[PDB]
């Protein structure tokens, strides 16, 4: 189904995003998070949660790449 494919893509993009951010590859990590946000029916709610979790300059960079 389309749903298992999408869940998988969403989760794998997040996991690569987190790993990249942990390595200090902020720009690359953010690019993958923007793919995860793009397939979500609630982008604003994902953005709120990322604002509460990410360092402010990475969140801000996120906002500019969306």
């Amino acid at each position: 189904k389309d749903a298992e494919a999408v869940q998988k893509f969403f989760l794998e993009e997040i996991q690569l995003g987190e790993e990249l951010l942990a390595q200090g590859d902020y720009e690359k990590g953010v690019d993958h998070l923007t793919n995860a946000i793009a397939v979500s029916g609630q982008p604003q709610q994902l953005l709120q949660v990322l604002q509460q979790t990410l360092p402010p300059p990475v969140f801000q960079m996120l906002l500019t790449k969306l």
């Binding site: 969403f10 989760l11 997040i14 996991q15 995003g17 987190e18 790993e19 942990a22 995860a36 979500s40 609630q42 709610q45 994902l46 709120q48 949660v49 990322l50 979790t53």
Partner: peptide
């Protein structure tokens, strides 16, 4: 890792 996945799925 994997935490970011749960926070965002639950969002």
């Amino acid at each position: 890792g994997x935490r970011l996945c749960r926070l965002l799925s639950y969002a």
